[PDB]
Amino acid sequence: FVNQHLCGSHLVQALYLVCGERGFFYTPKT
């Protein structure tokens, strides 16, 4: 794996990939 520059929807796609059907929580800040 390589370090990643992820912003916006690009971050939720990365999460989706890594967690798959295990699913995840998306929690930005304020």
Partner 1 sequence: GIVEQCCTSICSLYQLENYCN
CB of 14 to partner 1, least distance (A): 6
Q: Does 9 bind partner 1 (CB under 8 A)?
A: no
Residue 8 to residue 1: CA distance in whole angstroms: 20
Q: Which residue has the tokens 């990365």?
A: 14
Distances 6 to 1, 16, 18, 21 between C-alpha atoms, Å: 14, 13, 14, 21
CB of 27 to partner 1, least distance (A): 7
Q: Does 7 bind partner 1 (CB under 8 A)?
A: yes
Footprint of partner 1 (CB under 8 A):
1, 3-8, 11, 14-15, 18-19, 22-29
